From a paper:
L‐Asparaginases (ASNases) catalyze the hydrolysis of L‐Asn to L‐Asp and ammonia. In contrast, the chain of ASNase from [name], reported here and referred to as [name], consists of only 172 amino acid residues. [name] is homologous to the N‐terminal domain of typical bacterial class 1 ASNases and exhibits millimolar affinity for L‐Asn. Crystal structures of the wild‐type [name], both with and without bound L‐Asp, as well as structures of several [name] mutants, reveal topologically unique tetramers.
Residue numbers in the entry:
A (entry chain B), C (entry chain B): 4 to 168
B (entry chain A), D (entry chain A): 0 to 57, 63 to 169
Write the structure that this text describes.
Amino acid sequence: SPSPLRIFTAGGTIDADYRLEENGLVVGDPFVAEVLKTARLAGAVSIVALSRKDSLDFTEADREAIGRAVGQAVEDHILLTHGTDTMVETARYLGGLPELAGKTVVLSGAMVPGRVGGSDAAFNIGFACAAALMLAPGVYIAMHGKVFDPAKTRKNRGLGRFEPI
Amino acid sequence: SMAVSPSPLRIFTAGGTIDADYRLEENGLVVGDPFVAEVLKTARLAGAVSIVALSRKDEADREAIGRAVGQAVEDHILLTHGTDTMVETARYLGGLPELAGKTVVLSGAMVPGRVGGSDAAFNIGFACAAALMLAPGVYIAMHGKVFDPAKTRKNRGLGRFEPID
Amino acid sequence: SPSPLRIFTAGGTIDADYRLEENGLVVGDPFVAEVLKTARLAGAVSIVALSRKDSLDFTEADREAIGRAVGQAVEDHILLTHGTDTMVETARYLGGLPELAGKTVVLSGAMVPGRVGGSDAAFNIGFACAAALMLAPGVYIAMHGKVFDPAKTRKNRGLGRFEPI
Amino acid sequence: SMAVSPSPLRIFTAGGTIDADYRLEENGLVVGDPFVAEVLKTARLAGAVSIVALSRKDEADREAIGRAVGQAVEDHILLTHGTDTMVETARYLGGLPELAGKTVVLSGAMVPGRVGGSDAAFNIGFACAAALMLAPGVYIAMHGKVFDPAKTRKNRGLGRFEPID
Ligand SMILES: [Cl-]
């Protein structure tokens, strides 16, 4: 084989792990690395850690630093693992950067942490890696076994899924 | 009308390592229930996927598969299958004119989904996205990449598909 | 086979599970039921749900209701799954009830939720079930592969383990 | 002096279903690395457990086991073992005067620890507690209960130990 894929990690629920000192979940090590370790990949794939800050908390400065970091990648196929609560805002922001116009940028994450039983994370990672390799240049959210247009997408808290507007 | 999520993908299960499970009576692995059903149960799909059983066995068998695939209404098809004869099945489906408008992807796992350290969940997400996003044809989706069956072979001892140059 | 064992659940970390609506862990269904489902038990074992309230929050009234509930059991072998933060206080309280003097009462739980990867919970449950069947009448904490005397025990936050005083 | 946690228990591994793992080359399960080591890695033990390898094979073999067990300094011994011949091993150890002061418990799993839905973690906790708490002798600890080897048999098709009345 495939075109080279670069993966950026911005934390979120997918990466949550339990810590005794917190008596609860923190943003841990990136779960995408745990999934790809056993995927027996053939192709060129490399992972870059960007942030473990609470995704809810992302400022314009955080989003800007992500856009610049993704621009540092010569790869044209990009996966960004991310919190779901501000995924639409990040995706809309990246969609407005002319610097990224030639890249396929896919955001994904998980509704349940990878390190918790019953997680969507491994499926989402496989689906998003294929989406990043296969879709035309642009910025997408890959969740729920489908591809969302960030400009026409919202997270619906009642449904527990992204939906079209 | 209120939005209706489509179910554009149909999955057929032909068994294979991906579906292996432990049985006390055999004191070993048999082909068990389809593991792709377990992955999709927790994938929080926006739509749904019709999963249909074709075989749990380890020329006529390939013909029954072509018939089931060719009869499907869906234009996006995933067949979970053993890796030992996946190339043979894929090459046979490749020659059926009935499939000309369909994206047909074969996949599976080198490690059973029910065994620790399995590629299965990743493979299922990657293959579902491949079946949705690739142009019509017949493909093997494994190792985070897409293989042309006519130009692919299985290496038994390394648990990998590899090109024929 | 063994003498009949009664298991009471008072929640705690062992039982934590992820909820989308909380965006984090809540006290969920009792994890001991998930472990015993695959233990292939021979003996008489039954589970009773007592509480899912935060164990940190337990009042004297909560502890008293637990002591009375355990007294309702005709079984002489008792496992109580519980939060670690107030486990010593509950165990010291039960140790002072003449009503329970003829019973073996073991408290246990987990430093990491059963539903999180890398959990001590399944081992703790097996070890505590044996302790409840095998120890002389009295009240114990079974954690870390050993038996603690509640009167001479504390949880050491720095160590992440119970230790003797 | 500052408290020193003892390591009163030694574990010997003779293989068996508990340790089975998937190998691509065999296209099936072999006896792999000892699963009891994986369980104890996350058990947050106050002490430690010396784990020693005796066999990974499927009269002389039983003699080597008696020798290793009889040479141990520890008075509390757990032997992880296949369930098919556990009774034979246990009966043989039962007749060795060298073991008269030792609590020796055999255990294992009807489902491999590396397969979903395994009894192994529970069995290991239950058996470690049995090895610490039972009076000297030789025992089989399975199904959440203690068996007298002289009066026990393995039922192959049900994956259970059962009494001889
Ligand atoms: Cl939490």
